[model samples]
Target chain A: QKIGILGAMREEITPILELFGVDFEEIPLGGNVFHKGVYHNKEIIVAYSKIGKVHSTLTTTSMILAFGVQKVLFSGVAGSLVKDLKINDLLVATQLVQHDVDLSAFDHPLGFIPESAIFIETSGSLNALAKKIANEQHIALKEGVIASGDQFVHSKERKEFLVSEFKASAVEMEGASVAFVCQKFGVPCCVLRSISDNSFDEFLEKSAHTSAKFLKSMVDEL
Target chain B: QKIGILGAMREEITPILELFGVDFEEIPLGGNVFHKGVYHNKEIIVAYSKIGKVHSTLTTTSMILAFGVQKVLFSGVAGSLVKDLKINDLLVATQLVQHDVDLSAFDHPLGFIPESAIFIETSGSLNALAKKIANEQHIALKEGVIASGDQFVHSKERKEFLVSEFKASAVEMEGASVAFVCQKFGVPCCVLRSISDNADEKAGMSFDEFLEKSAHTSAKFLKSMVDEL
Candidate 1:
C-alpha cells in the first residue's frame, strides 16, 4: 500500500521534500508536479496542492487516480480558531466541513453538500495512529473539526462565527475537499495541520516544521 | 482545435448531448465521463461537470489537460440579479467574480485572490464570435458581470449584495471557478447562462429549480456558437 502526502504551502512542503531527500522522480500532474519515491521502506508521493477548495480537489483526485494511494495525509498549516491552540501546535482533523457552503434556500443545513453529511469524518484508525505518534514524540496535537472555506480567517468576527456555527477548532481552505475526494475513492485520509499565528504567508516557513515532522513520522510508522 | 463543452445540470446537458446525437465516445474522468466526437466539421468534447466550484474546476482542468481541448464553453442556467433579465434570456459573462470571497480584513478588496485577479474575465475573441452569432441568430444576448459562489442565491438581500458589490447581473455557483481554471491554461472560454424564472426568489436552489426551456435555449445557442467557431 502506497502513501500520498499533499502539502499546501511551499514553506510547509519544504520540510517534507527535504525529508524525502533527493531520491525521487518528479512527474508533472496537470499544472502541478508530483514527487514519487521510496522513503523509510515505504512508497510515498508528495505535491504542493496550493490553496482553495477547487485546486485541492484537482490535486487530490488526480493524485488518487494516478498513484492509487491507499492512504493520504495532508501536511499543511492553518489558522487556529481557539486561543488554546497556539502557533506550531499540531491538529489532526477529526471531521471537516466547508463553512462557505450554504444551501439554506433548499432547506439544507449549512456546510451541507446536498448528498451527504454536512461534516465529513476523517478515518478513525488514522486519527488513532496520529494520537499514538504525537504522544510518543511529545508534540502538541489536538483532534477537532476543521472549517474549510475559500477565504482566510483574519477578523475576530469571522473566526467567532466558525467556532459558534461549526464548532471548528481550525480554519483552512482545502481539508474538507481533500477528505471528500479521499472518501469517494474509498482511500482513508487524514489532514494534519500546524496552527499558525499568521495566515498563508512567507513568514511561517520556520514554524511549518512541527506538522511536517508529524507527517513524516506518520508516513514512516505506517 | 478541439472544442469542449462542460455543462452544469442534467437538464441543461441533455439537450447538448442530444444535439451531438449518437456519434460520441465516452471516456470516464474520475467519477464523470467526457464525450468526444465530431460535430459540424469540428471536433467536440462534452461532459456534465456537475454543480459547485470544486467540481467545475476539476472537470475543466481534466478536460483541458487530458484531452487537450483548445477552447471550452459552459452552457448552463443562472439566476438573474437584474430585473431587466427574465426567463429564457441569455447572458454572456464579461467578467466573473466569486461573491463570497471576503478578504477585506487584509484590505485586498472583497473578492481579491491575493496573486491572481479576483475578478476573472472571459476571452475577448470568444465573446466577439459569440456576440456575432447571437446577432446573426437574433437572440437577446446581454453581456455583464456574473457572480459565483458556493451558495445559491435565494434571498433578496444576497441578490442585492451581489448586484451592488460586484455589479453582477446574474448569480450562479460554478462560472467563476470555470473561468478561473480556463484563464490559468490560456484557453479561451466563455460561460453562457440562460436566465431562470426563479430569479424572482419565488423559488430557490431547491431540487429541480431551473427552467428546462431556459437551459435548452442556451444549449441551442451554444450549437450556433460552435458552428461559427
Candidate 2:
C-alpha cells in the first residue's frame, strides 16, 4: 500500500523526506512539491503541507485523491503543554481535537463536528506500531491527546486554557485537521509530534532537529 | 473572465448557488461539489467550501487550478464585532487578517507571514465595485476589516479582543484564508459578509433561524454584485 507522509513545515519532516534516499522523484503540483519514491519496499510520497489546518487538509486531500495513498503518516513538532511532556519528547497522538471549533449554532458542543466526536480518535494500530518503533529505538514516547488550531499558543494563558480545557498533552496547528480529513475520507492516519518547546524556549531549533530525527527513525522502521 | 464564488457553509451559500442560470455543470472533486455555469453573462463556479481556513483555501486552490477561475468572490455571514455594524448589516471587507495567526517564532509580527503584511489587502477595484453595486441596489454596506480564524467567535471576550486587536468590523472563519490563497496566486478577491448575530445569540432554534435567515440577504447582495461584475 502506498503511504502519504505529511509535514506542516519543512524543518519538521525534512529528515523523514530524506529517508526516501537519493532515488526519490520530485513532482510539483497544486502549490506543493511532492517527493515520491519507495522506502523499504513500500511506495511513499512526502510533502510539506505548510502551516495551519487549511494547508494540512488540502495536502491530505491531494494525497488521497491524486496520489491514491492508502494511509497517511504525519510527523511534526508542537509546544509542550504539560510538565511531564518536556522538550524533545516524542508524542504519538491517540486523539486529536480542534480546540478552536465552536459549532454551538447547531447545538453541538464546542470543538465538535456533526457525525464526528469532539475528540477524533487516531488509528490504534498505527499508534501501536509507533509505540513499538519508539521503544525499539530507545526513545521516550507518550501517547495522548493533541490539540490543534490555526493560532499559535504563544502565551501561558492560552497554553493553560488548552491544557485545562481539553487536557491536551501538546498543542500545534495541523494535527487535528489532518485527522479530521483522514476520517472524512475513511483513510487511517496517525500523527507523531515532538515537543519543540514550552511556548517560550531558546532551544527550539535543536529540539525540532531531535524531533525530526525521531520521526525519521519511525519512518525508517515502517 | 471566469470568477470563483466561495462560501464556508451550505446554509451561507445555498441561495447564491441557486441563483446560477441553466447550463451549469456539477463537478465534484476534493470533498466539494463545484457548480460551473454562466451567471449574468459571466462564467462562474460557485461552491460551499465548508467551514474554517483550511477548507476555504483548499476550495480556492481547486477553483484556480482545476477550474481555472480568473477572479474570486466570497459571500457569507459573520458575527458583528462593532456596535455600529448591527445584525443583518452588510459589510464588504476592505482587508482581511487572521486574528489567530502567531508566527513570532520566525521574528514576524503576529498574523504576519514573510513578504506579506499582517493585514492582507483585498482587491481594491473589487471592493470599489462592490460598494457601487450595494449603493445602486439600495443595500446599506459598510467597508472595513474582517478577521478570520478557525474558532467561531461566540463569546463577548473573544469578540472584544478581535475588535480591539484588529479594529475588525466583523469576524468569520474563512475570509482571510481565501484572501491569502488569492494573494499567493495573484488573483483578485473580495469578501462580503452580513452580520448574523451579536455574538450572544442563544444556541437553539434562534441561532439556526438567524444564520439560515441572514444568508438570504448576503445572497441577494451577491446577485447584485455579480450582475455588476
Candidate 3:
C-alpha cells in the first residue's frame, strides 16, 4: 500500500489525504511512540515527532518495523537555504545526508563512517518518479540537495554559510534522520519540501503564513 | 600558540605537526579523541573522529565540552570531487553542512535544520583571511562545501550523485560536526582539508597512506593560517 501523511504538522497532512481522495485512520501510538494508521491505499503512518534525530529515528523505525512499510514519503516544510528556491517551491530530495557526521579518527578520511561515509545517498530512482508525478500535476518542483539538523537557519549568516558549503537547494530539520532509518531498513524513501521562509530574506519572520500556504498547495497538487 | 595536528594516523600527525615546529599533545577525552595541549604558542586540540556523523558528532562535541577549546581548526584529508582540487590541494570550508536535516513538519520553506541552516559559516573575515594566507604560501586553498554523514561512499554512483545534489567541493565526516559544535559555543572554527584521493578516481582501495600525510599537511597549514590571521 502507498501511504501519505503529515509528519511535523497534522494540519498539513490532513488536507493532502482529502486531495488524494483518501482518509486517515488515526490510531494512538504510546509515549514517544508515533501515531499509526493508513492513508490512501498505502500502509501509512503519521506522527509529530517532537524534534531532532532521536524522535525521528524512533518514530520512523517503529513505523517500518511495526507497520512493515516498504517505502516512505516524508513531506514537510523547512527554511530555505538557496536563494533561488523561493517560498512554496517544492524540493524532492534525491539523496539524504546527516550534515553533521564526522570521521577524523582511524585516519581513513575525514568523514569516514566505517561503512557509511560523509554524505549518504538514497532514493535515486524514486526521486525521479516523484518529480514526474509532481510535473504531471503542474507543480513547481526542483530536485536538489537537502541538509538537516536540529538547528534552524534564522539569520543571513547561517544561510550564506549553508549555500556556500553544501550548494544545497533547501534546508530542513527532519529529512536526513528519517532517511537514516530508511537507509538501515534498505527501504526506498523520498522527501517533499515546501518553502515556508527564506532564511536569508528580510521577510523570513513575516513569511511563515505565506510559506505554510505554499506548502498546503503543494500537498493539494500532489 | 598554533597547532598542526592531522586527522589520519597517529604517526602522520607527529611528523606533520613537527614541520610546523613541536609535537601534538594526546588528549584523554576518549572515543576517537585525537590530541589536546600546547603547540607552538597556541593551545591546540586535534583528533581523528572515525568516519560518519555519529563518530564525528560525538568526538567534535567532546572536544568542545571536554576540552573547553576557544577555537577549533579541523585539518583532514578529503576526496577531491572536481578536477581543480587535485591531489594534495587544499580546500578550506567557509561553511559545514550536515547535508541531511529535513523538517517536513514545520512547513518552513527549506529542507534542513532551523538554526543550523545553511551550514556553520566560519567567521567570514577569518575565512577570507585564511584563503589569503593559503594564496601567499602558493597553496591552492579554495573555499567550498563539504557533506558529512554516517555512510562510506564506495560507489562512484554515490559520489557523483552527491557532487551534483549538494554541489559539495569535497567530502569528509568530522568537519561538519565540528562546525556545528564550534558554532554552538561561539568558537571560531575553520576546516582545512587536503585532497588525498579524488572521489571520482579511486572508487576503492586507494590512498589509505596518503590520508595521514594529507591530514597532517592540512593541520600544519591551518596553524599557519591561524598565526597569520
Candidate 4:
C-alpha cells in the first residue's frame, strides 16, 4: 500500500506521519523535497511537492520512477468556490475539467493535445474510500465539479460566475492536474480534498488549516 | 482622472468620447490606440488589446500601469456562445477562466495553478458597483461566466462542448487573460461587454462588423460607470 501526499507542509504533516508509525526516506526533486515515506502500517510512500501542475507532475512521476509506488493518494485542501460548500467541507471530485486547456486557434476545443478529455472523471475506487471516510466523520460530502485555475478567487461575484458557468461545487489549484497525470500514467490514483475556502469574498483570511491534521489523523487510524 | 478610449478606428470612438466632452487619441495597442490625452470630468483610459491573449494581456497591463487607474471598467463586444444571450444585450463577467493554461501531466484540475484560484472572481466592490450602475440606468445587464483563450469561439459544436463541460455562457479571445493579469498585479477590474453575435448558426457571416454601432453604445454606458466611480 503506497500513498503519496502531494503538497505536504512540515508543520502539518509531521504529526500524522509520526502517529501512523510509517518509516520512510527523503529524496530531493528540483527545489522541493519528496518525503518518500510510508503510511497505514505498510508500503505507502508519501511526498509533498511544490504547489502547481509542474511541481505535482514531477513528484508523482518520480514516485512511479524512483519509488515505484503502484497506487498513490493525493491529500490536500481546496477552495470552495461555490456557495453551498463551506469551510471543512469534503470533496471527491467525480470528474475533472482541465479548465485551462484551450486550443481553439488550431480548431480543436478538446485542446491540441491527445488524451485530454473536455471532462475527466475521477477514479471510482478512491472516490468510494473518500466517501466512506466522510461518512465516518459525519460530514456531508460533495462529489461534484471542481474548477482548477491559477488565480485565487477573492470575490463573491467571481464565485457566482463560476457556479453558473462551470456548475462546479468547489475550486482547487491542483486536483485536476494530479488526476490528469495519474490517468495518463495508468496508475490508480485518488484525490481527496478538504474544502477550506469558498474561493470567494474573504477567502484569504477565512479558510481553515485543518486538512493536514485531518489527513494525518486519518492515516494514523487507517 | 484620465480616461482613454480604444477602438479599431477613430471614427468609431470619436462620437462616443465626444459624448463625455473629451478629445480622443489613437494609440493603437493592436488595431489602433485611442490615446485620449485628457479625461475631462473623469480620468479613464481604454484601448482595444487587439484580438488575442498575448495582445490583450500586454495591452491591458500597460493601460493599467500607464494610466495609474484606481479601478478599470473594460467595455467591449463579445460573441455569445450560448443561445440565451441575445444580440445587443450587455454581459458583465463576474468570473473568468483562462481556458488555455494546462499541464495535465501533473493531474491538477483544469485551469489549476499552484497557489492561485483556478477561476478568478472579480472584486466584490467593483462587481457590485457595476451591477448597481446597470440597475440604476435600467440597462439589461447579465452577470455570468466568460471562457477566454487565444482562439475565437467560432464552432457551434465546440461551444457546446465547453458549455456542457464547463457550463460557460460566452466565449472570447481575451477575458481570462485580462482577469489573470489584473489579479496578479492587484488591480481592480470589471469587464462590461455587449453581445455582438450569438455563437449560433448565423455567427459567421453576421459577425464581421455587426456591432459597430453597438460598440459605441456600450462605451457610452461605460462612461457613465466612470462618472459613478
Lowest-scoring 10 consecutive residues by lDDT in candidate 1 chain B? B198-207
Residue-level lDDT of model 1, residues B1-229, one tens digit each, is 7998988766778899897685889897655688899886778999887778877877887787778899999998888888788777899999999888776656778887645676899989989988888888787899999999988788788877887889999988899988888886789989999987454456464225556887788999888888777
The prediction achieving the highest TM-score against the true structure is: 1
- List the lowest-lDDT window of 10 residues for candidate 2 chain A: A199-208
Docking class of 3: incorrect
Fnat per candidate, as a fraction, reads 0.44, 0.36, 0.08, 0.11
Please give, for residues A1-222, the per-residue lDDT of candidate 4 as tens digits.
555555423344554455456565666633346665544445656666445443454455555555556666676667787667777677778876544444443345532222235565677876776677668777777878776654455568867766776677776656665665566546666676667655433432232234555455445444
**lDDT per residue (tens digit) for residues A127-154 in model 2:** 8878887888787789889999867777
Task: Provide backbone clash counts, one per model.
Answer: 0, 1, 78, 42
Give the 10-residue window scoring lowest on summed lDDT in candidate 1 chain A.
A198-207
lDDT at A33 for candidate 2? 75
In the range A131-173, model 3's lDDT, one tens digit per residue, is: 6666776777787777776555566776676666666667766
Where model 1 places Cα greater than 4 Å from the true spot, the runs are A23-44, A62-70, A82-87, A154-161, A197-206, B23-28, B36-43, B197-200, B203-210
Instruction: Give residue B63's lDDT in candidate 2 (0 to 100).
Output: 82
Error of 1 at B124 (Å): 2.8
In model 2, what are the clashing residue pairs, if there are any?
A54-B54
Q: Looking at model 2 chain B, which ten-residue stretch has the lowest summed lDDT? A: B199-208
Interface RMSD, per-candidate values to 1 decimal: 2.7, 3.6, 11.4, 13.9
Residues A6-73, candidate 1: write the lDDT tens digits: 98776666688787675778888656788888876777888887667867887887787678789999
